[PDB]
């Protein structure tokens, strides 16, 4: 199997878990759950959502 990464939060996606979304510019996004999927559809920036890997990498928290 392959363990994919969340396109919004960077969480690990196990097989059969979450959803996938193909945008009209032929780019693939993978969501581990409906929470990150809905934040993506609400167009929030993952650099400003405090629990994401990209936020913690930006803010040097636990790095």
């Amino acid at each position: 199997m392959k363990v994919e990464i969340d396109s919004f939060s960077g969480a690990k996606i196990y097989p059969g878990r979450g959803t996938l979304f193909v945008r009209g510019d032929s780019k693939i996004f993978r969501f581990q759950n409906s929470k990150s999927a809905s934040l993506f559809k609400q167009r929030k920036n993952p650099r400003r959502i405090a629990w994401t890997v990209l936020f913690r990498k930006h803010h040097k928290k636990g790095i």
């Binding site: 392959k2 510019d25 032929s26 780019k27």
Partner: protein, 225 residues
């Protein structure tokens, strides 16, 4: 020979197969006649690999191949990649491509020396083609057809292009590729010639509905005699 073959009724052989000088690739869900054509014509000198690319029977439109290298999309699994690495000779290089257009047989029309690509490919993918295949690259369209792999059939000796192609585009592409090109049809008039057939230096395989003048044009332009 332009060999008459069908893929279970399908007269498009370039979709389901990829033929180079050094190797051949065929789909796993194929008929005995379809395998027997490549086995009889190619012989034991050239390996024939039954493969699946990205879980799809279509392999010719998914992959772009050369005698020096093979390009596979990102969606190709590790089991398929390892099976191709074991089955293929050590000379060829297999490298995954991470690019949005992702259907390399449609995107890329290539031979041993020179290649035509889709105009809008990424620069890293162009450099990856030039590295792995060792092939000089041009970004060009065939009379406004961006899918140069589907709308051109190319070999070392010559090339077949789209029938509704401007003549000025024909000498421009011929001078750019350093091979003679003929506008013609395959499979009783189907426009998609690269999807219609596969060709290499000594063999061309086409659909059963490809007519005799079309087959004569094929053997004339590819010098298979």
């Amino acid at each position: 020979m332009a060999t008459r073959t069908q893929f279970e009724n399908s007269n498009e052989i370039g979709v389901f197969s990829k033929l180079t000088n050094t190797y051949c690739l065929v789909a796993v869900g194929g008929s005995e006649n379809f395998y027997s054509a490549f086995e009889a014509e190619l012989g034991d000198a050239i390996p024939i690999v039954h493969t699946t690319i990205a879980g799809t029977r279509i392999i010719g439109r998914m992959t772009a191949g050369n005698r020096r290298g093979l390009l596979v999309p990102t969606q190709t699994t590790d089991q398929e990649l390892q099976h191709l690495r074991n089955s293929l000779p050590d000379s060829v290089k297999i490298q995954r491509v991470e690019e949005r257009l992702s259907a390399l047989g449609n995107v890329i029309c290539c031979n041993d020396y020179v290649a035509l690509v889709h105009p809008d490919i990424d620069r890293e993918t162009e450099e990856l083609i030039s590295d792995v295949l060792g092939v000089e690259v041009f970004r060009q369209t065939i009379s406004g057809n961006i899918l140069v792999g589907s709308y051109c059939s190319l070999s070392n000796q010559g090339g077949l292009v789209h029938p509704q192609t401007s003549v000025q585009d024909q000498e421009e592409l011929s001078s750019l590729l350093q091979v003679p090109l003929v506008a013609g049809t395959v499979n009783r008039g189907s426009s998609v010639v690269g999807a219609g057939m596969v060709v290499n230096d000594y063999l061309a395989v086409t659909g059963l509905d490809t007519t005799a003048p079309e087959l004569s044009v094929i053997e004339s332009i590819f010098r298979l005699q």
